[PDB]
Amino acid sequence: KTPVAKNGQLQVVGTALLNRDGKPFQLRGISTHGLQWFGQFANKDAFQTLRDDWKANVVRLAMYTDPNANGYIAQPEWLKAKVKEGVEAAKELGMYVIIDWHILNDNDPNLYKEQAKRFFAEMAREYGNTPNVIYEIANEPNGDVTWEEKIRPYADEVIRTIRSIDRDNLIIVGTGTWSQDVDDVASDPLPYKNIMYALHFYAGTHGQFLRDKANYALSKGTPIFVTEWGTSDASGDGGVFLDQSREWLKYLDSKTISWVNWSLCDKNEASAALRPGADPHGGWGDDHLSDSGRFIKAKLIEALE
């Protein structure tokens, strides 16, 4: 029985994500790399391998926005079509699916706020009628871009647009310093239904100092969802950090915090789950899973156990 058939319409109560029966529920899965670069993996066959064999219950569609990255602003119809294919695939498989407005070098989400509103309004009219879709409205605010000054104002307007159409599907809002500054949200939280706040980390870079920030946020009532994390270090030059990854996943499991690994592609970098040449349509043998991918697959299987 599929994840969506078993869990239905999710709800946020306090810090906690719950399923349709009010039971605590953890989403676990993996993100595409940028759809403009590694979109070949965002298909129903790859996703079925993730569901059936890896035991993932969520996928994330990383739609870069920055036109210099060949993001949505440079080629909106072509990228929107990829997002739709990804969402339709997830719907057919009964998986949850995150539509990620993947800001990064465009470090202030306000830069493309009008485009974000129109895009998410469309996504909500198309997909807001079933439980699957999750709207991630600003991947990683960074630089001099704070909760009070820039992120919350952006989020309030985009959330009002979404909530005028889709009253209940989850919305996840990024936080300052590449979605680290979750401890700033409680100073002025958003008064809408089913909102959670992003925490991102790399196992080779972040440790207890960032877990303390998460705990502080949780203690003030801020719901956290890890929409992106890596097994490598921030630069990616350290190889993989599996004992540090295990420590982080133990922490997230203890708090029933949902998590999404980066990334499902075959780029020659430590955080990529697949080895170069891996089949876009799934069924990956061990030869084409990287050290990171082998670990993530095993952890997902173990969690369902």
In DSSP notation, 66-101 reads -GGGT-TTTSHHHHHHHHHHHHHHHHHHT-EEEEEE
User: What are the beta bridge partners of residue 60?
Assistant: 31, 98
149 labelled catalytic:
no
Closest CA to 257 of 181, 176, 200: 200
Rounded least distance, CB 166 to Ca ion, Å:
4
Smallest gap, in angstroms, from Cβ of residue 133 to Ca ion?
8
Size of the site for Ca ion (CB under 5 A): 4
x/- binding map, residues 220-239, to Ca ion, per CB under 5 A?
--------------------
> Which of the stretches 82-90, 126-134, 189-197, 206-214 binds Ca ion when contact is defined by CB under 5 A?
126-134
Among 71, 128, 223, 293, binds Ca ion (CB under 5 A): 128
CA distance 205 to 100: 23
CB of 233 to Ca ion, least distance (A): 38
Closest CA to 100 of 44, 173, 162: 173
Which of the residues 77, 88, 140, 247 is marked catalytic? 140
Cβ nearer to Ca ion, comparing 56 with 170: 170
CB proximity list for 124: less than 8 A, separation 6 or greater: 135, 161, 162, 165, 166, 169
26-65 binders of Ca ion (CB under 5 A): none
128 in a labelled binding site = yes
**Per rule CB under 5 A, is residue 133 in the interface with Ca ion?**
no
The strand pairing partners of 31, in sequence order, are 60, 262
Residue 168 binds Ca ion, judged by CB under 5 A: yes
User: Which of 89, 152, 97 has its CA nearest to residue 128?
Assistant: 97
Quick one: 128 or 176, whose CB is closer to Ca ion?
A: 128
Q: Which is nearer to Ca ion, 8 or 280 (CB)?
A: 8
Residue 283, annotated as binding a ligand = no
Cβ at position 126, least distance to Ca ion in Å: 11
How would you classify the pairing of strands 16-18 and 11-13?
antiparallel
Name residue 218's beta-bridge partners.
none
Q: Does 12 bind Ca ion (CB under 5 A)?
A: no
Q: Which two tokens stand for residue 260?
A: 């999404």
Positive/negative CA dihedral, 202, 207, 209, 213:
positive
Q: How far apart are alpha carbons 235 and 24 in whole angstroms?
A: 35
Is 140 one of the annotated active-site residues of the chain?
yes
Q: Which of 136, 228, 269, 305 is catalytic?
A: 228
Residues that bind Ca ion (CB under 5 A): 128, 166, 168-169
Catalytically annotated residues: 140, 228
